Write a structure and sequence with these properties.
part of a larger assembly, 6 chains, A alpha/beta (240), C alpha+beta (194), D alpha+beta (360), A: 240 residues, alpha/beta, 4-stranded antiparallel beta sheet, 10 strands, 20% helix, 18% strand, flat, D: 360 residues, alpha+beta, 3-stranded antiparallel beta sheet, 14 helices, 40% helix, elongated, Phage major capsid protein, HK97 family (chain B), Gene transfer agent protein (chains C, F), Phage_CHP (chains C, F)
């Protein structure tokens, strides 16, 4: 407050301190391998199962980071109590509406993009990015002008410019596609807007003693995640 | 490390004239009019042509205060000092733009604006866009370019636009009859930061596009707006008053209004 | 942590007609109802005595647990022990707005530790300067027949005593009032920080 | 290096790796908090700065920057290695060769970046929300990163204070036990019990001010020590004691004060802690100090300055401690000069080459 | 340097940074309060003033100003470094080179200003509410700022008293425990209990003056020690004791009296505190004192006077401790002269060059 | 800290018609003869004996807590335990200007330790000489029926005792007067500086 001379200034509000908890859930796979099949074959089965487990976990937790609920798995940002931007509060994430219910708005496509970029807020756009799946970026490139040329990477050759409105694009295939109310495009500073807590190892272990004709591998990693800063992620609602 | 919400930092401080002052006020001295010299006649009296009436505008140098109570993982002294400096950098930004007279610097929007072409000294000049809701429908950006070219060639050597984020949004939403984005043509460009050859300052305390709001300003604020201040920040690390809460006392004193009424031109979204 | 009751017991759920059989009043008199106003006054005075010594509930009336800061980071053990189906953890704000929250909290039923443990490793946060009231219905059953009978007997051993002596006049059983209560009291040995 | 690419991806290339959170709090609770952790680092960092060096390059080391001398630099450098296991040295090069500025960047606010091949590409000096992103994708590599040995971590050091972090909190809290015991304790030297005719009875404020004035004047103080103190009916004086008087966690503090000195490697005789005589007569304990925890530390840091600073020069330079005219090693110098000086069989120039003299 | 420019704008450029809050209260409670903290600073500050120096400029140091001699200057200078981690020296320069005034500015009333690029631009001497604002935006830079090593702070020192601030409050309050125990304590040497026929009964003031006068005359004092003391019916003598007699926090004070001496680095033998024999015979403990906490401290301040005062001269001057004819290092001088003097193999002029002699 | 009551009970809030039934209903001489206003004078004597041993209030009377200096920095535990809704925290100065405050504090209700617990660390400071003064309404409910019935029975076990025998005459019940009170007493273990 601007302090007057004859005011005898009162104390002001100490800012509330929030404490948001990462639950840090577990993620494990237990493949059952035969002992004879592991002893006879020419392929390195203990290596191949490790490769497939390490491929599976980095995709299962990738879908958890986007669309997982709070309980039993890390919660993704798209599951959180979102509100229209302008009506924004801390206990939510902001969206902007695109216009038409099916797709982008007919009279001005990408106009739903260029206002979300400037609705995110100027401080988090220092290092921000877009997040989409593949067939949303397809529909983004299919946005054309009145003539028929492309708004983004104008020439029909030399595609994927890795730069949308000055900010990078992450093709994360675990977002919903374009639908009646689905949120296909997300934008913001996810380095400050989403915290991942994890135990950074893939512990893998054989124990034939559980199932005795078999080997029964078991690999496990635990990752937890939620939003750190609610003011750093905005979304596109394809509704109104 | 404790986090916080990241607020806007751009504050009109880096484009206005920052003057270190030590007294209670800062008096700028501007003449209101011209010499009025005429071409002399060969047989005439020729005396007392005129004299510029000077005017003292007073920067009152108000003070700003925020008083939080403190009430070993993260250390409060450094963190609260890094939050209250941000709040003093952001709360003076609102006063520099739309502050009123009482106890705070009067921003450049609160200076009784008069339509340009009937411009006098005691006010700021604006240019109208057209329809009241937004930019003109037939020719967008004509309001922007004649806002630029209705200012004066001496101040346009180093002048800048002042908007918030969602007015620069509505500027970048301008498109031709094919829809090709007059400003930063592709979807791969970004913020071009050189509108009409001049820089853009995204200051969030500007109003947005409304029925009569002055959402776009343009000017050489180095001559226009004078921020007179004292550079330090008071730090009363108070160990009294309340045993439970430290109740740190931090204050910076700062003042400012417009020094030159010709430098700043506004865009009124009306007829 | 205030822990008031939303609704009391109906009174018609109390076994006044069976407590009268206990106290040996009389069988076939035409009056039969001169004590009804006072017999349930001692049954409510003996249940509420055993509800405090055992921290049990016994009629499954609805409660309201209005508290502000969580006792431990995630657990929040409830005081009234035999619980079922916590209705609402509506999170009030500093002033006014009451937003009920599904919030990803669970309920761990137990007669000893009726926790409300959260699944996301942190219960829903609390707006600074605002309370978090929890509506829950805790007790054994709705009617008197759904009780453990030894605890129901400890009401009848106790409310018969208040009926037979009015003021504090002094007057050893194998399973008395106290020895029936003691398997329903809360056995705690923590005086610590956590 | 061939396996370098595999560990880099797991951590995540291009992203800062922080390591230990609580590093800044061990400084305030273990180095600004207790004297044993304070003296142990100050005893070492003022010892490694005093040791001369053997090579030009040392002209930079003699005057690194403004307001931060040669001896003041290594106190800042080793004082970060003992505290947080990591040493950092920014070099500012206005000139192409032998950059004329050195700055010890504190290791609280520095973070590594793993990069592509596992060896680092970025260092991030992070003050407030502000980063810098120093770059290691070049030949001069502007920051030398001195690691203490850490077997489990791939990017930082171990910081001996972390290994003694339990024994610091014993010594901090046992010392604060006796402080708050001297500040929260009610011992009385007695109690004048007044029961009365009943089991309970107060005495009137007339009688109570009488009881103070005969206690204030005639019984308290040094000068009234031992008055015979008539007690009438009802009154009685029960003298209280204070049964643990000395020695509140006295040996567990004195044992934790030695385990802190154990981890940094100082002997108990140098720092001044009490304890059993292990070393004898300071010709040993000062020689043991500059041989088990100073000169191995200094020859490891000087070996990193011998390689990082030679990357700015053309020719590589060696840079080692002197291990000569350091006056704590005189018992190893008497013992080696009197051995060869008494060997009269071999000639004069044959022992000048042994003791290190230029022969004549 | 580059990191510093970022660090400034976090704290705030152009505004004073104060640092320690309690450093004005640790002086009164830790240097004017207890003898151990008093003697420890006086033992060091009177030792650094006694050490000669090796270079004109020293003519300034010999006579800095009126009423403040050479030895009195370093007692004031080191006495601020040991107390508050910071040393200050104002120079008044009527003349361009070698300014003829030095003044130890006390570090309670001095505050730094970070300035633009992180390295300081202002120092603010604040007494009352009145300031001075010394300026560092020039070449001579009129204040040398000697920092003790502080790992967490960027502008001040650590001040070993801050590290011993728990052991000061133990030693201050345990010593004040025994003071107020000798001043607030009622011990009686007995109690003549008079019950009576009832459980309670007073005795009349006729009987009571009889009871005083037979106690005043015949029973108290040295000369009446042990009279057989007939007790009739009703009377009874209960002798009281005093169960903790000696030793009220005697070892916890003596352990805290050693931790204060530990933090400043003085040995327990020099200051005079009791304790187990660590050093032997004062040829070591005085030699340890001038090698672990005096000469490293003195070579660090003298390295800052060698650079700050050379900014007033044209040519740079070195200024180091003598490390010769300081009589605590005579055991390091016997040991080095008898080693090379007994080495008869190398010739006469070959050992005058080793011992530091002018060759012949 | 005077802590005088603003208003007492009305007297018509007390269960005199019910206490006649706890005295002799269902068994007895008849309704008999009891000085009605005498029976009101023993209920006010038994409540004021249990209001003192439990530090509760039981009728929800209005209080005025006028104390000079704040004990803690911010906490200010209120003595009369079951509280609701501070009426006003008006602050008088040494002359009597009586300037109330309306924000800066949030009463945190609780049956154990009711507090004032201002926001942050700043609780309204005291004018030198000008005592602070807090008006609050403390107690369970406005009528007698809103009480915990075990505490209400401790009044009836005690007020009947003052009715049955007048002087201090001699006379170990399981849930007597004392056993019904002990779960409402204040359990404190601080004798220290905070």
């Amino acid at each position: 407050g601007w302090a007057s001379e004859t005011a005898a200034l009162s104390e002001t509000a100490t800012p509330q301190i929030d404490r948001i908890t990462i639950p840090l859930h577990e993620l494990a796979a237990m493949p059952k391998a035969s002992q004879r099949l592991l002893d006879d074959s020419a392929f390195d089965i203990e290596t191949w199962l490790a490769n497939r487990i390490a491929d599976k976990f980095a995709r299962a937790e990738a879908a958890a980071f986007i669309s997982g609920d709070g309980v039993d798995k890390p919660t993704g940002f798209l599951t959180k109590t979102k509100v229209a931007n302008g009506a924004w509060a801390w206990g939510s994430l902001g969206y902007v509406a695109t216009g038409a219910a099916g797709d982008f708005a007919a009279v001005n496509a990408s106009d739903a993009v260029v206002d979300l970029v400037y609705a995110l807020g100027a401080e988090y756009r220092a290092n921000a990015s877009f997040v989409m799946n593949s067939k949303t970026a397809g529909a983004v490139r299919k946005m054309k002008d009145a003539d028929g040329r492309f708004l983004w990477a104008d020439s029909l050759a030399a595609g994927e410019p890795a730069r949308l409105m000055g900010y990078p694009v992450l093709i994360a295939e675990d977002m919903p596609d374009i639908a009646a109310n689905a949120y296909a495009i997300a934008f913001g500073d996810f380095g400050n807007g989403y915290t991942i807590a994890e135990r950074p190892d893939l512990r893998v272990l054989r124990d034939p003693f559980s199932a005795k004709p078999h080997v029964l591998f078991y690999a496990s990693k635990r990752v937890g995640g939620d939003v750190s800063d609610f003011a750093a992620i905005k979304l596109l609602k394809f509704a109104a | 490390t404790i986090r916080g919400v990241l607020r806007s930092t751009a504050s009109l401080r880096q484009i206005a004239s920052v003057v270190n002052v030590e007294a209670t006020s800062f008096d700028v001295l501007v003449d209101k009019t011209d010499m009025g010299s005429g071409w002399a006649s060969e047989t005439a009296a020729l005396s007392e042509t005129a004299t510029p009436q000077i005017d003292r505008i007073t920067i009152p140098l108000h003070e700003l205060a925020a008083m939080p109570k403190a009430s070993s993982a993260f250390d409060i002294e450094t963190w609260l000092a890094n939050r209250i400096a941000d709040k003093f950098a952001r709360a003076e930004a609102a006063a520099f733009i739309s502050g009123d007279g009482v106890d705070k610097p009067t921003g450049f929007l609160t200076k009784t604006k008069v339509a340009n072409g009937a411009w006098a000294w005691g006010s700021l000049g604006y240019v109208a866009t057209g329809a009241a809701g937004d930019f003109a429908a037939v020719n967008a950006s004509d309001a922007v370019v004649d806002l630029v070219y209705a200012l004066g060639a001496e101040y346009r050597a180093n002048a800048s636009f002042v908007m918030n984020s969602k007015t620069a949004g509505a500027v970048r939403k301008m498109k031709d009859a094919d829809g090709r984005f007059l400003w930063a043509d592709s979807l791969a460009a970004g913020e071009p930061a050189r509108l009409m050859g001049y820089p853009v300052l995204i200051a969030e305390d500007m109003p947005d596009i409304a029925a009569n709001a002055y959402a776009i300003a343009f000017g050489d604020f180095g001559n226009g707006y004078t921020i007179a201040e004292r550079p330090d920040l008071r730090v009363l690390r108070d160990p009294f008053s309340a045993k439970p809460h430290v109740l740190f006392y931090a204050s910076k004193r700062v003042g400012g209004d417009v020094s030159d009424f010709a430098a700043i031109k506004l865009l009124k979204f009306a007829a | 942590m205030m822990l008031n009751e939303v609704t009391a017991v109906p009174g018609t759920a109390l076994p006044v007609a069976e407590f009268r059989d206990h106290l040996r009043l009389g069988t076939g008199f035409a009056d039969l109802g001169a004590e009804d106003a006072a017999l349930l006054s001692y049954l409510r005075a003996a249940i509420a005595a055993i509800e405090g010594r055992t921290a049990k509930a016994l009629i499954s009336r609805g409660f309201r647990l209005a508290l502000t800061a969580w006792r431990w980071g995630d657990m929040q053990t409830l005081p009234i022990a035999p619980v079922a189906t916590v209705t609402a953890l509506r999170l009030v704000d500093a002033a006014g707005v009451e937003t009920p929250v599904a919030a990803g909290w669970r309920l761990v039923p137990d007669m000893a530790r009726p926790r409300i443990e959260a699944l996301g490793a942190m219960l829903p946060m609390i707006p600074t300067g605002g309370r978090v009231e929890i509506d829950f219905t805790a007790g054994f059953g709705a009617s008197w027949s759904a009780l453990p009978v030894d605890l129901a007997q400890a009401v009848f051993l106790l409310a018969a005593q208040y009926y037979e002596l009015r003021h504090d006049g002094a007057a050893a059983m194998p399973f008395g009032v106290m020895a029936l209560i003691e398997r329903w009291r809360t056995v705690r040995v923590l005086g610590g920080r956590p | 290096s061939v396996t370098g690419r595999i560990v880099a991806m797991a951590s995540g290339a291009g992203r800062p790796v922080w390591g230990p959170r609580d590093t800044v709090s061990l400084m305030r609770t273990g180095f600004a908090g207790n004297p044993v952790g304070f003296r142990s680092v100050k005893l070492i960092a003022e010892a490694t700065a005093a040791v001369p060096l053997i090579c030009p390059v040392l002209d930079l080391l003699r005057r690194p920057n403004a307001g931060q001398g040669r001896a003041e630099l290594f106190e800042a450098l080793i004082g970060q290695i003992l505290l947080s296991g990591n040493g950092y040295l920014e070099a500012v090069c206005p000139e192409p060769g032998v950059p004329r500025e050195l700055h010890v960047l504190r290791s609280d606010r520095m973070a590594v970046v793993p990069g592509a091949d596992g060896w680092p590409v970025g260092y991030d000096y992070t003050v407030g929300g502000r980063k810098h992103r120093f770059d290691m994708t070049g030949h001069p590599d502007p920051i030398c990163h001195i690691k203490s040995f850490h077997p489990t971590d791939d990017h930082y050091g171990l910081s001996p204070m972390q290994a003694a972090a339990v024994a610091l909190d014993v010594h901090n809290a046992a010392s604060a036990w006796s402080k708050a015991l001297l500040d929260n304790a009610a011992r009385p030297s007695g109690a004048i019990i007044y029961k009365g005719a009943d089991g309970q009875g107060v005495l009137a404020p007339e009688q109570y001010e009488r009881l103070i004035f005969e206690m204030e004047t005639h019984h308290q103080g040094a000068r009234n020590a031992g008055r015979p103190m008539l007690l009438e009916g009802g009154l009685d004086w029960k003298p209280m004691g204070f049964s643990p008087s000395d020695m509140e966690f006295h040996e567990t503090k004195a044992a934790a004060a030695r385990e802190i000195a154990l981890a940094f490697g100082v002997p108990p005789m140098l720092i001044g802690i009490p304890g059993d005589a292990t070393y004898a007569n300071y010709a040993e304990a000062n020689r043991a100090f500059y041989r088990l925890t100073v000169l191995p530390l200094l020859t490891r840091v000087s070996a990193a300055l011998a390689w990082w600073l030679s990357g700015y020069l053309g020719a590589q330079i060696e840079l080692k401690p002197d291990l000569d005219q350091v006056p704590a090693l005189a018992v190893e110098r008497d013992q080696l000069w009197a051995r060869i000086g008494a060997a009269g069989f071999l000639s004069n120039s044959e022992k000048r080459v042994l003791l290190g003299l230029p022969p004549t």
